[PDB]
């Protein structure tokens with residue numbers, strides 16, 4: 221009665237509310253186009269089956285694996301071949317082939333309506349049926365983010381509830397909601413980006429990469445913990461993210477809860493910053509641990525030169541246990557460098573490995589590997605200069621212009637990429653500056669590079685969907701640690717052919733005057749990308765000037781009596797003269 225029914229076990233432990241939540245998320249992520257009602261009935265059916273099994277675990281089919289049961293359920297969906305031309309071919313297969321097929325078919329750019337707040341109608345729908353309202357939130361977010369961290373989404377759904385709980389009762393109801401919903405959306409976009417990076421590391425580089433990344437990060441966050449505790453947490457967390465990215469949202473949640481329990485049981489040994497996190501409820505606790513502030517450096521951190529540089533038997537220790545020795549190094553170097561980005565630590569660790577590989581084949585390895593730490597100095601200075609440079613730009617020109625700079629920089633790197641994707645990436649990269657440049661200067665490098673990694677991964681995911689550029693492919697697939705430097709190193713692609721001019725691309729009309737500011741920016745930034753594509757060798761200062769002229773023209777005509785006549789008269793001349801400005 222314990223080995224028998226996995227679905228009963230999961231139902232019992234997780235409980236009905238979370239069980240149904242996670243199954244809704246999983247179904248919304250696998251079948252992103254189906255209507256809400258379809259998914260709700262699937263969820264209810266599955267829950268019913270779980271409760272029957274919980275009664276009699278020896279009943280028929282209660283023995284079957286979670287994947288088999290979820291996959292079967294997905295395969296009983298109305299109009300599958302019509303809605304999803306491919307996922308039905310997946311339904312011909314058994315597990316685990318079927319699940320791999322499903323995962324293959326997930327869509328990272330489903331191209332759905334933007335989630336626009338409607339305070340009146342939303343509060344109404346929230347009041348008449350809260351469960352249906354929060355379920356809809358889960359569904360809408362889950363399908364817009366098919367790799368979103370399942371329990372994390374349940375946590376955000378609870379924050380969404382709290383927003384509507386405090387705001388709907390009175391007043392504008394929109395001046396209460398809109399800023400809170402805007403903050404929630406930014407947290408959603410961030411959270412998705414982090415989880416997608418973890419899943420992408422699994423997909424593209426494997427579990428050893430995910431472990432290394434986790435070792436680095438957790439060592440930084442918990443420098444007091446010893447290598448055994450870090451290793452344990454990393455093994456557990458890796459398994460957690462493996463199951464979540466693999467689709468096992470139930471295993472995902474259950475192992476995530478166990479890990480939080482363990483961490484809070486050993487918080488004294490792990491970190492002083494976990495106190496607050498451990499006093500909170502389940503979901504909130506996991507959240508808090510995931511985002512916990514880094515603990516203060518221990519006063520008894522060991523000197524590393526003696527064991528990792530000066531020791532004469534390093535080649536023996538390395539040849540004996542490559543993985544273990546390298547892991548120890550990474551733990552030790554990371555815990556004492558919260559001022560480094562995770563990817564920087566991974567590069568340093570690769571350099572350490574490469575130095576040992578080289579030195580241990582030569583006559584006198586000792587004298588060779590004695591200056592290993594000194595090989596880290598260039599790797600450190602490069603990103604520090606970049607961050608310093610870009611923050612100097614950000615603080616001079618502000619987000620918009622900084623974004624414009626990045627949109628130019630990346631369009632020259634990859635002019636074959638679609639204007640929407642370039643705009644999206646450029647704007648995300650620009651937001652990095654707003655997030656990181658204001659922080660204490662010690663935190664600017666880690667903040668900047670870690671968020672850059674998220675944005676570049678987003679670009680790499682879109683590029684997997686729609687491959688256009690071999691340079692992007694190489695940078696996206698060669699080395700996870702080297703991705704940001706690889707991208708930074710790209711110059712203008714001179715094999716590119718300037719896109720043939722099309723006046724309507726740069727032609728504006730009065731409609732733009734009604735848009736909110738950000739959608740107006742996006743229109744202008746799209747034009748900018750198109751300018752670069754047409755004139756790849758134009759300097760960023762030329763493009764900045766031309767875009768200024770375009771911006772001024774838009775502002776004038778939007779303020780005009782006959783806005784449309786203003787556009788009709790002015791636009792064509794600006795369009796013609798721009799070409800000449802961009803030679």
Ligand SMILES: [Cu+2]
Pocket residue numbers: 221222223224
């Ligand atoms: Cu049993």
Ligand SMILES: [Cu+2]
Pocket residue numbers: 229233
């Ligand atoms: Cu149990």
Ligand SMILES: [Cu+2]
Pocket residue numbers: 287463466468
């Ligand atoms: Cu599995």
Ligand SMILES: [Cu+2]
Pocket residue numbers: 372375411507510511
């Ligand atoms: Cu969170």
Ligand SMILES: [Cu+2]
Pocket residue numbers: 531532533534537
């Ligand atoms: Cu030794």
Ligand SMILES: [Cu+2]
Pocket residue numbers: 728729730787788
């Ligand atoms: Cu017009």
Ligand code: NA
Pocket residue numbers: 425426427428429430
């Ligand atoms: Na790997």
Ligand code: NA
Pocket residue numbers: 639
């Ligand atoms: Na276009």
